[PDB]
Design a binder for this molecule. Structure first.
Ligand code: B12
Ligand code: SF4
Ligand code: SF4
Ligand SMILES: [Cl-]
Length: 384
């Protein structure tokens, strides 16, 4: 009965493209509660989490009289077909793998909606509540308890067949499905992810200081702290380094969902056209990927930082125009800093001139920083 329904649900899920499906109870996540409070205490959370901790750890609060949670995962591609080369004259930035193709929020919700209708169609007073990423639960906590994957040292839920390259989602129900068993930790004594993290944001095994994580930092709307400006590289959104160095992801490149295929021209886009992209064009080109959810400003800020990283002198005129003309202080200021960082002394005087016209105090500060960078590199070249 409930066993039959469970088997039928699994078969149906597989037929519509769910790559892994698991079951847990709707019991409280007691371990998670203590962890969330500790992470909060340490200042290690991002701010993208649901703020109400009781809601995050109590499925029965979210859906009254809940009895189970159905967890799903879909594998996403880890290699980009026909990836364009970034060259000296044509530098490109990169979106993380979780922002390739159609927004996973839409894809996984579409699958949950099907699973919900499957259950409701039985006409048995079944009630459900679904979420992907933007709901109250910890999707990883659910996935772990449901046997989808294990919690690895890089904080990823990691599956044996698909590695960590999976999107997660879940559906709370009032059906007393027999729960599954958590699976074995496979990390052993490996520390490759912790060693490779460019900022040391993985402060302990399975412990992220999100405030230092490049993935978080790419998504902030203000000025990027200077210490991270030389660590972001050419990343425009997200960071995949603690996954790509992982042995458990070796040879894991799954292309099972056509709409997830990256479009290289937006997944690995030319940086200079991003500096001058209209709101209309951004919405048309980028509007359906997950990495567009904060709008274009952080992407353009990151594009500026990437050009500074490449020391792309050919971008200097456009950065100079941005410094003067962009209505957003974060863009004007970051452009000024980048002009300094790129290191062409022919632009030092225009920085000095811009300083006296800029009225935003934070943008003014960034122009000062850019002037200082040029002074410092000028002195270094002269052995001073
Ligand atoms: C906030 C957020 C972030 C933050 C913080 C991430 C973090 N590690 O906490 C930032 C912006 C940095 C981020 C980055 C990324 N994220 Co994110 N993010 C979320 C979000 C919205 C909540 C995460 C959260 O609550 N974290 C709080 C921590 C404390 O808990 P948790 O990781 O959820 O749960 C684990 C810990 O509590 C741990 N734990 C519990 N008790 C204890 C005890 C001890 C001793 C220890 C050590 C650990 C421990 O076990 C839990 C289960 O694994 C979720 C969606 C959701 N609603 O859950 C997506 C989610 C975690 N993100 C996801 C993705 C894909 C990413 C990126 C890979 C994107 C990218 N390419 O840049 C990176 C990965 C960074 C990393 N190494 O973790 C996926 C991960 C899927 C998977 N297979 O694991 C999720 C589930 C979204 C989804 N539905 O697909 N993200
Ligand atoms: S996503 Fe990048 S910055 Fe964040 S923990 Fe992983 S490797 Fe470090
Ligand atoms: S790199 Fe090593 S320690 Fe890190 S998640 Fe992969 S197997 Fe675990
Ligand atoms: Cl039932």
């Amino acid at each position: 009965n409930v066993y039959q329904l469970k088997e039928e649900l699994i078969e149906y899920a597989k037929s519509i493209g769910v790559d892994k499906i698991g079951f847990t109870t709707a019991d409280t996540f007691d371990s998670l509660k203590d962890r969330l409070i500790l992470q909060e205490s340490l200042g290690y959370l991002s701010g993208f989490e649901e703020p109400d901790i009781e809601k995050r750890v109590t499925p029965k609060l979210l859906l009254p009289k809940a009895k189970s949670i159905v967890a799903i995962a879909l594998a996403y591609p880890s290699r980009m077909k026909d990836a364009p080369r970034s060259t000296r004259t044509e530098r490109r930035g990169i979106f993380c793998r979780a922002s390739w193709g159609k927004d996973y929020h839409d894809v996984l919700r579409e699958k949950l909606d099907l699973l919900e209708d499957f259950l409701k169609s039985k006409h048995e007073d079944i009630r459900t509540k679904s979420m992907v990423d933007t709901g109250e639960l910890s999707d990883r906590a659910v996935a772990e308890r449901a046997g989808i994957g294990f919690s690895a040292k890089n904080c990823m839920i990691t599956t044996p067949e698909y590695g960590s390259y999976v999107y997660l989602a879940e559906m709370i129900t009032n059906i007393p499905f027999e729960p599954d068993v958590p699976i074995e930790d496979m990390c052993g004594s490996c520390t490759k992810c912790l060693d490779a993290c460019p900022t040391g944001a993985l402060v302990n095994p399975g412990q992220l200081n999100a405030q230092r994580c490049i993935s978080f930092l790419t998504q902030t709307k203000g000025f990027l702290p200077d210490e991270f400006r030389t660590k972001i590289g050419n990343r425009l959104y997200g960071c995949d380094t603690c996954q790509t160095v992982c042995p458990l992801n070796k040879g894991k490149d799954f292309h099972l969902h056509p709409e997830m295929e990256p479009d290289p021209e937006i997944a690995k886009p030319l940086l200079k056209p991003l500096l001058a992209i209209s709101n209309r064009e951004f919405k048309e080109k980028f509007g359906h990927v997950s990495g567009s959810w904060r709008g274009k400003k952080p992407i353009q800020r990151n594009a500026i930082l990437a050009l500074a990283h490449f020391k792309d002198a050919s971008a200097l005129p456009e950065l100079t125009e941005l410094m003067h003309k962009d209505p957003r202080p974060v863009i004007r200021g970051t452009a000024a800093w980048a002009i300094g960082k790129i290191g062409d002394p022919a632009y030092a005087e225009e920085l000095e001139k811009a300083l006296e016209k800029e009225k935003d105090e934070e943008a003014k500060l960034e122009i000062e920083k850019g002037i200082e960078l040029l002074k410092a590199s000028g002195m270094t070249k002269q052995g001073l």
